[PDB]
Every structure is written in structure tokens, then in C-alpha cells.
Design a protein around this nucleic acid. Structure first.
Lengths: 285, 93, 306, 52
RNA sequence: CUAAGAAAUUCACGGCGGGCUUGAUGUCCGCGUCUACCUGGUUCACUGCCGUAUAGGCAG
């Protein structure tokens, strides 16, 4: 009937902090004990990297943690219900699986690498239930939406976002950046970011490569994907995109589709649902 | 093509993070090492050059414009110093 | 808005020692505006003809004030500090004809009109005005030129008829950065008249009713204090004749035998000290004096200040 | 208690235009006044007053 | 052409002797702080790279 004043959503697709360990190649499957970066001098024995984080795919899309109006609550839940009757989460889930497929969570530890392999493990207990292996340099990173045996990893995340099972994913990334150069972890307020005396990447930075989805935007599709952001901006390159003057924008496409029940051929609604999977204090007033 | 092109080859002569002990060590003592030369006379401050960084650097270490080597000749095989030889071909348009 | 200035001129920070603080038979404090409108006319007959320009308006901005007063033991009033005058030829002490003094830090927005703007640069005019104005005295007080640790404050100049509407709020909000630690004295003649028909309870004159705006007067609890329209002060607002005009030789104690004379009285009005951010255009802040010599009115005000 | 020196500074301004009155009735008196001031100045400088 | 124009407050000095502020006291009782994020912006000069003068081997 109108927008509420207090509304927040919770972070689905939450990664953990990815600890980065080095280690020499030809010990790959027997990588129980590879040491981590011990600080700030890096050897030449170790010739590849090892980046591991766990990923939980929770479930629930348009259910707020803390709403304020019950009519708006049920209208938003029936909008997400009419989205999910149309199709699963599998179109968003295959695009999340694309970012899982390469190691694009290695931000600059991937550019300048000769072979990067990513191993995703769907685990029910400590026992591993089904494993995956992908080649990061040889798979996509831009477009054309085509690689076999990745659709099962898409259907897994579609089930986990739709709630058809608990999904826990334990990923490992082996980056042959070369014979022991000095890699770059995240940096706090200059000091490198650590966890326990082991260098790592923040989970919002690991998570920022996962909602790098959005190849649909007002300009032509020649530059590729942007992270799904309200008023979708880039913070250091400088270009702050998706101006609210023109209508393709999260708050506009949310408030006109919940309150004003819009349905032309507008089936790029994946940006709005991908913002709801991101969560956050949306508005309000 | 003009006579314009810039270069950067040979700038490594006297480091500034390590100055006082490069001057005289030949495995002998120092009895006179306080009034040897006046370093307090010269004072200059300008760095308009390309900042090119490495590991364990601040903003930029140094470089000074040492222009004058220029030919219309490009690189050759086997003769590399850092990444480029004496001269080259690039024009304005 | 008579004779709109084509250029404002900012004499930046004039420091004045021993200015006259009595200013009228009824008021005391900051000196009269007629002192400033006579100071700009004394500038005008020293550099205004040599530069073919017209200095006619003046904006009064007081930054710092200090009076030589002292409060006596057991009184809530003030008395003035004095000077010891020389003796007589008899050897006795002369009379104590008391005078009030004050130190004073002021800024002067002048307003320039003539054709000498278009012949000289804007920096030629400002030096010839500033270095002239360090040879003169403002209110009986010496204008003290700069020497300090900091830097001398420079004499700027705008051309307020020049520029677009973005420059008409880029320029008039640039000078206000140089006028802001102090306050500007403007003339409020409409307040004292609309407060005169506001008094419908009594039927007074303007004398007892200008005395009823100077007050922090305390109203009975139906305690409370009556509302504040701003920082309002009484100012001398000109003169008024109490004699017909005399031929320029028929008094032999005049200042000169070529100008007519009148014996005049004072003429009191209302003014307000206000921060220059309330000012829309700084040319509206200027003091002029108009005369009606067919009447006996010789007065001064800020016109064009709504 | 730790300072032994008094510093006293002031600024003097020497104006000039000395014999010109700021007020005079008679034009004849001003005319034979500034001429007498000039025949003081042109015959001998202010140097005797200026040294003192 | 300015309520214009002018101006030496100054000398000297013992504030000072004495003193009981006490006694008594119940602060309690209840509570949801939450959601999200790239420091990929210029955030001190840590012992082993043959000479300010434009001049000289950087598998960092």
C-alpha cells in the first residue's frame, strides 16, 4: 500500500575469510600441511598459492529480518513468490557458479598467473559428498554462458537459495602465480591483513567477487560484469553508474514492482533479486 | 616522426635510503669522517618523473631527468639493459 | 537606490586609537555615522579628483571595540577616563572638560562610480586610496597603519556591475569572508515608525518610543522579557535646523568666510548591528547622506536596505 | 621573576604639511601665513627641529 | 573638509593577632541494539646493488 520505514535483509551467500597459504607444487592432493605466509619474507621453494574459504548458501529471498509494515511484508513475499513460481534461482545461480568457477576472488593474485585451478566441495559432514575441479584461465570470466558439468553446481545453489537443502561449499584455489613471488593480501589501517599470523582476504572482498554478476545495465554489453550494488557504483576506478534519473536502478525497480505490480518483458529482475540476496538496510522513509 | 621520445635506462648511481656507508668502506678504519665534504650546500626538491614502484617502497624512491640519449633506432636482439634500448619508433599521430 | 556603485572598494582593517565615544548629547559608544560619511568625503576631495572617480557610499563594519571607561564602586553606570590637560599661565589647573575615547578596529566598503574605473587598473585605485587613508583621522582618532608579525591586509576591489549571476554570488560571498568576524551597522528607519503606530495604547512621540526599544524591559507574568527584534542601538541620524540660513560673512567666528551657516540640533534614529550573512547584496549596506536645504534636514542613512 | 628586560614598542607617523591650518577665517591671513611658513622652510630646513 | 582642530594624573606606604564544624543513614527493580560493505586513491627513509658534476654488468 506504501513502503515501510524500517526494513533490513540479511546476507545470503556469506563467505568466510579466505586464508592464503603457499606451498610447493606436486604436493597438491597431499596438501594437508602446507604452511601459510609467515610474517614478511617469501621464499622461492613454494611455487603456487592455496586460497580456501567456506561458503554457506542459506535460503529465503524476500523475507526481511526486521520489517515494519505487514501489508508490505506480505506484498513483498508474494512478489518473491511470483518471481519463484516463474523460475527457480538457477539463472542467478549459474552466474554465481561462474564466479565460483574461476578464481576471480583472487583479485590481483590471479592476473599474472599461468595455471589456476579451483576445487569446490559440497560437504554434508566432514566427509566430502561431491567434488568439482575447474580451470580458471580456461573458463569464461566474461560471457557466452557455456560450460558443461557446471549446471549441477548451478542447481545446487538454486536448491540452497530456494531452500531445498543445506548447502555448504568448501573451496580451494591453486594459483600458479610463479616460483615464489611476493603475493598481496588485504590491508588494514600500512599493514597487511592477518588472521592468526597467517595472511588472508576479507570476507567482504571475497564476497565482492561473488555478486560480480551484473552484465545487464543501461550501456551496451561490451565491458562485462559489475558488482550488484544499489546505485551501482565503482569506488576506485571512479565511474558511479546507474543514476537515479533514468529508471534502471534498485530502489526504483523494487518500489515500482512491489507497490505498482509492473510486468512487461522486464525479466531482467535478477538485479533486484540479487540485491535481496546481498541484503542490507534498504531505505527507508 | 619527431625528435621527441622519452627514455628511462640507466638511473642507478647513489641510493638515498643507504647513503653514509657506501662512501668509504674498503676494510679499513675511519678517523676523519665528519668534515670530509659539505653536503649542506645543495638543496633541491622536484620529482616530475613516472612513479614506478616495487616491494618495500614509500611513495617513490627517486629519479632525475638524464635526457639526451635519443636515436631514431629501435631495440636490438641480445642488448637489453632494463626493458628498452637507445631510441625507438613512436610518432605523435 | 540613488547612484548605484559600479565598484566596491574594501579598506580591509583600519585600526583607530582614541576615537570620539560620546557621539551625541544622548548616546555614547560607537561613533556617529556622519563621521564615516565625512571621512569618505575627505577621501573624495584628496584622491577622488586626481583619479576622476567618485567615492560616495560607505559600509561600516566594526570588528573590535574598546572604550576607556570605568565602572565606579557601587554604581551600575560607567564614567569616562580622561587626560590631564596642560596648566594655565597662572600656574593653576585648567577646567576638566571631559571627553570620551575608544579604540576601534573597522572595515570600510567604499563605493566607486566614475569614469576613472575604465582608465586605471583596479589595483591602481586601491593603493592610492589606502595609502592616502593612512594620512587621515577617522573620528578624531588616528588611523594606525600596519606593522605586525603577520602580513598587511590588502585593499581589494570588486566591479559589482560586472559578471554573471553566478559571479553575483561568487563575488558578494567572497568579500563576506573578509567582513565576518565583525558586525555591520545599518539604518532601521521603518522599525521606529512601525513601532510608533504599534503603540495604540498610548499616543506618544518618537522620542519616548525610541527609548522603548533600547530596553531589556521586563514584562509582568500574566516574569518574562519582551521580544528581541535584533541588536538595536540608538544612532545620531543627522541634523535639523533651528535657525534660518546665514549669509557667508555675517558671523565672524565661522570656520570660513565663504560658506553659509545654520545653527542645528541633532536628530535621533534607530540602527541595527547585524552579521553580513543576512546581507543579500553588499551595495545595500552603504551609508549616504542626503540633504533638504530648503527644509533644515541634513541627514544620513542606508537607503536600498529592505 | 625570570624576565629582566622591558620591551616597549609604539608606531610613530610623521604626517607633514606642517604650516597649513586645519581652520582659518581670513584668506589674507592664510595667504601671508603660508608664505611666512615657506620663507621659514625655504631659508632653512626642518633639520633643526628634526634633529631634536 | 569627520560634535572638526589641542592635551603628562603624580609622588609615598607593615593588614594582623586567635580559632574543634559535628553526630546519624538500604538507591532498587525490569530490559533483544540491529542489518550491509573492495581502503584495486598518493597511509615515516629495517645491518650484503664499484664516486654531487648530467657518465658506467638490476635470472628483486
Amino acid at each position: 500500500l506504501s513502503t515501510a520505514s524500517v526494513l533490513a535483509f540479511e546476507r545470503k551467500l556469506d563467505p568466510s575469510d579466505a586464508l592464503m597459504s603457499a606451498g610447493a607444487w606436486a604436493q597438491r592432493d597431499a596438501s594437508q600441511e602446507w604452511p601459510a605466509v609467515t610474517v614478511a619474507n617469501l621464499p622461492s621453494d613454494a611455487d603456487t598459492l592455496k586460497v580456501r574459504f567456506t561458503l554457506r548458501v542459506l535460503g529465503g529471498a524476500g523475507t526481511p529480518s526486521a520489517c515494519n509494515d505487514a501489508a508490505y511484508r506480505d506484498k513483498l513475499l508474494q512478489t518473491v513468490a511470483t518471481y519463484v513460481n516463474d523460475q527457480g534461482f538457477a539463472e542467478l545461480a549459474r552466474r554465481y557458479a561462474h564466479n565460483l568457477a574461476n578464481a576471480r576472488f583472487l583479485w590481483r593474485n590471479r592476473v599474472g598467473a599461468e595455471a589456476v585451478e579451483v576445487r569446490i566441495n559440497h560437504i554434508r559432514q566432514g566427509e566430502v559428498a561431491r567434488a568439482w575441479r575447474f580451470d580458471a584461465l580456461a573458463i569464461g570470466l566474461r560471457d557466452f554462458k557455456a560450460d558443461a558439468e557446471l549446471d549441477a553446481l548451478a542447481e545446487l545453489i538454486a536448491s540452497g537459495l530456494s531452500g531445498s537443502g543445506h548447502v555448504l561449499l568448501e573451496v580451494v584455489a591453486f594459483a600458479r602465480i610463479g616460483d615464489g613471488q611476493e603475493v598481496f593480501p588485504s590491508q588494514e589501517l600500512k599493514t597487511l591483513y592477518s588472521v592468526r599470523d597467517a595472511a588472508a582476504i576479507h570476507s567482504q572482498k571475497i564476497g565482492n567477487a561473488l555478486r560480480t554478476i551484473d552484465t545487464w545495465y543501461p550501456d551496451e554489453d561490451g565491458l562485462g560484469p559489475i558488482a550488484v550494488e544499489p546505485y551501482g557504483s565503482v569506488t576506485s576506478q571512479g565511474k558511479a553508474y546507474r543514476q537515479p534519473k533514468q529508471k534502471l536502478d534498485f530502489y526504483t525497480l523494487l518500489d515500482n514492482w512491489v507497490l505498482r505490480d509492473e510486468a512487461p518483458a522486464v525479466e531482467q529482475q535478477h538485479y533486484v533479486i540479487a540485491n535481496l540476496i546481498r541484503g542490507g538496510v534498504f531505505g527507508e522513509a | 616522426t619527431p625528435y621527441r621520445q622519452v627514455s628511462r635506462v640507466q638511473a642507478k648511481s647513489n641510493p638515498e635510503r643507504l647513503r653514509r656507508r657506501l662512501m668509504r668502506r674498503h676494510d679499513l678504519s675511519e678517523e676523519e669522517a665528519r668534515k670530509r665534504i659539505p653536503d649542506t650546500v645543495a638543496r633541491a626538491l622536484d620529482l616530475p618523473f613516472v612513479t614506478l614502484r616495487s616491494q618495500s617502497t614509500g611513495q617513490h624512491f627517486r629519479l632525475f631527468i638524464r635526457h639526451g640519449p635519443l636515436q631514431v633506432t629501435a631495440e636490438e636482439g641480445g642488448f637489453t639493459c632494463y626493458g628498452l634500448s637507445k631510441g625507438g619508433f613512436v610518432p605523435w599521430f | 537606490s540613488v547612484t548605484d556603485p559600479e565598484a566596491l572598494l574594501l579598506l580591509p582593517r583600519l585600526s583607530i586609537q582614541n576615537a570620539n565615544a560620546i557621539s551625541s548629547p544622548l548616546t555614547w559608544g560607537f561613533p556617529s555615522p556622519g563621521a564615516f560619511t565625512g571621512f569618505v568625503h575627505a577621501l573624495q576631495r584628496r584622491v577622488g579628483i586626481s583619479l576622476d572617480i567618485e567615492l560616495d557610499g560607505v559600509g561600516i563594519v566594526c570588528h573590535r571595540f574598546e572604550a576607556q571607561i570605568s565602572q565606579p564602586a557601587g554604581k551600575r553606570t560607567k564614567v569616562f577616563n580622561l587626560t590631564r590637560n596642560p596648566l594655565n599661565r597662572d600656574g593653576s589647573t585648567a577646567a576638566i572638560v571631559e571627553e570620551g575615547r575608544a579604540h576601534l578596529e573597522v572595515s570600510l566598503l567604499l563605493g566607486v562610480h566614475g569614469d576613472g574605473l575604465d582608465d586605471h587598473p583596479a589595483q591602481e585605485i586601491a593603493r592610492q586610496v589606502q595609502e592616502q587613508a593612512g594620512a587621515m583621522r577617522l573620528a578624531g582618532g588616528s588611523i594606525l597603519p600596519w606593522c605586525n608579525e603577520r602580513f598587511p591586509a590588502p585593499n581589494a576591489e570588486l566591479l559589482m556591475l560586472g559578471g554573471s549571476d553566478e559571479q553575483r554570488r561568487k563575488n558578494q560571498r567572497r568579500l563576506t569572508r573578509r567582513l565576518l568576524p565583525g558586525f555591520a551597522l545599518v539604518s532601521r528607519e521603518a522599525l521606529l515608525q512601525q513601532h510608533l503606530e504599534t503603540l495604540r495604547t498610548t499616543l506618544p512621540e518618537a522620542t519616548t518610543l525610541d527609548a522603548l526599544l533600547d530596553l531589556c524591559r521586563i514584562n509582568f507574568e500574566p516574569w518574562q522579557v519582551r521580544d528581541k527584534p535584533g541588536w538595536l542601538v540608538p544612532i545620531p541620524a543627522g541634523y535639523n535646523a533651528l535657525s534660518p540660513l546665514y549669509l557667508p560673512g555675517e558671523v565672524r567666528n565661522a570656520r570660513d568666510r565663504e560658506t553659509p551657516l545654520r545653527f542645528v540640533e541633532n536628530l535621533f534614529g534607530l540602527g541595527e548591528w547585524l552579521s553580513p550573512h543576512r546581507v543579500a547584496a553588499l551595495s545595500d549596506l552603504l551609508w549616504y547622506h542626503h540633504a533638504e536645504p530648503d527644509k533644515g534636514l541634513y541627514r544620513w542613512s542606508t537607503p536600498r536596505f529592505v
